[PDB]
């Protein structure tokens, strides 16, 4: 709010609108690459560029609400940010699985998790001034329940890849083949 002026404009809401626009663009552009498992050089470059743009927008929102400023907290709460974040969850849940299947997309998958981490730190800074019955908490549980399937999928992803650090190097896999650098026949891997 540009106090003192007469036609104040909401830069925060405008940023939210641009984030929603780029989220819809990301959803369309990813979902276009459905069924086809080849990601060409253009499909990497034009895609990582939008990933970077979305990451920068998320960082801008994070700096908007980083201080415990209730005005911007409530402005973000009463906006279309929830649609953008549920769309981002929907794209993340499918793209992690799609990218983990094949190589030559490790950098793209890393950038996607980078955007996911920036998104989640924004969504967590959303709650740094939380109250036991705050409205932001209700809005966030509403977005979680309306996108339960995608967040369930990402939680399963994280749990599967977190149950791996201890499953291997704790009991038997560390001494299966104590030769040197990692060598496995991929059959003993499966049976282990």
Residue 163, C-beta contacts closer than 8 angstroms, at least 6 positions apart: none
Q: Is the dihedral of CA 81, 150, 113, 160 positive or negative?
A: positive
Give the resolution in Å.
3.3
Nearest CA-CA partner of 79 in 32, 167, 11, 166: 11
Residue 48, C-beta contacts closer than 8 angstroms, at least 6 positions apart: 107, 108, 111
Scan for tokens 């979305």, then name that residue.
54
Nearest-angstrom CA–CA distance, 170 and 175: 9
| Burial of 71 per CB tally in 10 Å (0-12, 13-18, 19+) | exposed
Cα 62 to chain centroid distance, Å, stands at 14
| Burial of 51 per CB tally in 10 Å (0-12, 13-18, 19+) | middle
Nearest CA-CA partner of 119 in 143, 145, 149: 143
Nearest CA-CA partner of 13 in 68, 59, 71: 71
Helix (H) or strand (E) run with residue 81 in it: helix 81-100
């Amino acid at each position: 709010t540009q106090t003192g002026n007469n036609t104040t404009v909401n830069i925060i809401i405008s940023t939210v609108d641009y984030l929603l626009r780029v989220q819809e663009s990301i959803s369309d552009f990813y979902w276009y690459y459905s069924g086809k498992d080849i990601i060409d050089e253009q499909g990497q470059r034009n895609f990582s560029k939008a990933i970077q743009v979305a990451k920068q927008v998320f960082n801008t929102l994070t700096e908007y609400i980083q201080g415990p400023c209730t005005g911007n907290q409530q402005s973000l709460a009463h906006s279309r940010l929830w649609d953008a974040v549920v769309g981002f969850l929907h794209v993340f849940a499918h793209m992690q699985m799609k990218l983990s299947q094949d190589s030559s997309q490790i950098e793209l998958l890393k950038e996607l998790m980078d955007l996911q981490k920036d998104m989640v730190v924004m969504l967590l800074s959303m709650l740094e001034g939380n109250v036991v019955n705050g409205t932001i908490g209700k809005q966030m549980v509403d977005m979680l329940v309306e996108s339960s399937n995608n967040v369930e999928m990402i939680l399963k992803f994280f749990d599967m890849f977190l149950k791996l650090k201890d499953l291997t190097s704790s009991d038997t896999f560390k001494e299966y083949d104590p030769d040197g650098k990692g060598v496995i026949s991929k059959r003993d891997f499966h049976k282990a």
